Design a protein around this ligand. Structure first.
Ligand SMILES: O[C@@H]1[C@@H](O)[C@H](O[C@@H]2CO[C@@H](O[C@@H]3CO[C@@H](O)[C@H](O)[C@H]3O)[C@H](O)[C@H]2O)OC[C@H]1O
Ligand SMILES: [Ca+2]
Ligand SMILES: [Cl-]
Length: 302
């Protein structure tokens, strides 16, 4: 019936799942749902000079991602979050960079990279001690409230909230600072999920380790509650070089746990946990913006 999250995570990994289309040096920052029995994946793109976004043509097996069409969005949605918002029967794509710090668009057909509505403000606030400003938003609702979580490349995690009845809409400028640590420990790539079958929420945050990017996990009993470190060191990570089972990459970086239910609750099944992540060749160097990031999938070994 129900499974619990392990205290120690062990994964197996695919190899590189796809190469970027001509003109891109990287595929990045994945968000994914199952839509009509197929994997639906949005991501950031990089040409090395600037970031854009794209969607893969829907595919049934991860092993077929390599042949999936890669469809550029004509208006960039960097570091996107995709979900179905059930109370209004509408799909939401939230992202960073444009007229506001965070932005969203809506659609009745999430497979179309250019079928999204006019951009609307999601968040208009500002944070201190950050070179980036607000970065890597995610959205998650319980039964009562819609939450915004984000990072700032600065060791902090931030949260905002509104009643679900007021979403889709603008969180405005206000936020709460919920976590504070070193820049390395709480860097970016924050994601939050409901653990199916448990009275528990799961937060993962990307950290900069000695050996590469990795994820630290935290749990809470409430989205407005305190977060308790779970697998939160480089030696005992949520997912990292230590436990990924990946050979092609020493980095486990910005992605999304695989969500079978596409809705706003961001529910994951702890019995069948999988992680769509970005990784890169250990030999790749140079400017961050030119790094050859690629998609991979981790599968939890039970
Ligand atoms: O163009 C800007 C982007 O580059 C920026 O993205 C962040 C840039 O810094 C990255 O972190 C660095 C990785 O390499 C390490 O050696 C450095 O210490 C880190 O700072 C981070 O991963 C990116 O998200 O955002 C703002 C854009 O204008
Ligand atoms: Ca994200
Ligand atoms: Cl809040």
């Amino acid at each position: 019936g129900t499974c619990a999250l392990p205290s120690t995570y062990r994964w197996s990994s695919t190899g590189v799942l796809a190469q970027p289309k001509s003109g891109w040096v990287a595929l990045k920052d994945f968000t994914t749902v199952t839509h009509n029995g197929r994997h639906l994946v949005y991501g950031s793109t990089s040409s090395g000079s600037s970031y854009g976004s794209m969607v893969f043509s829907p595919f049934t097996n991860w092993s077929d991602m390599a042949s999936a069409g890669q469809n550029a969005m004509n208006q960039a949605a960097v570091a996107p979050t995709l979900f179905y918002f059930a109370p209004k029967n509408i799909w939401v794509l939230a992202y960073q960079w444009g007229s506001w710090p965070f932005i969203y668009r809506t659609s009745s057909d999430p497979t179309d990279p250019n079928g999204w509505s006019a951009p609307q403000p999601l968040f208009t606030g500002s944070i201190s001690g950050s070179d980036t400003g607000p970065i890597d938003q995610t959205l998650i609702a319980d039964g009562q409230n819609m939450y915004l979580f984000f990072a700032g490349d600065n060791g902090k995690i931030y949260r905002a909230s509104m009643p679900i009845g007021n979403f889709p809409g603008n969180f405005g400028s206000s936020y709460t600072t919920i976590m504070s640590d070193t820049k390395a420990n709480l860097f970016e790539g924050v994601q939050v999920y409901k653990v199916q079958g448990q009275n528990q929420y799961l937060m993962i945050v990307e950290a900069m380790g000695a050996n590469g990017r990795y994820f630290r996990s935290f749990t809470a009993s409430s989205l407005s509650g305190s977060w308790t470190p779970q697998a939160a060191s480089e030696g005992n990570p949520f997912a990292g070089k230590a436990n990924s089972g990946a050979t092609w990459t020493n980095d486990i970086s910005h992605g999304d746990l695989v969500r079978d239910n596409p809705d706003q609750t961001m529910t994951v099944d702890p019995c069948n946990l999988q992680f769509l992540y970005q990784g890169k060749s250990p030999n790749a160097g140079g400017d961050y913006n030119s790094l050859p990031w690629r998609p991979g999938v981790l599968t939890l070994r039970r």
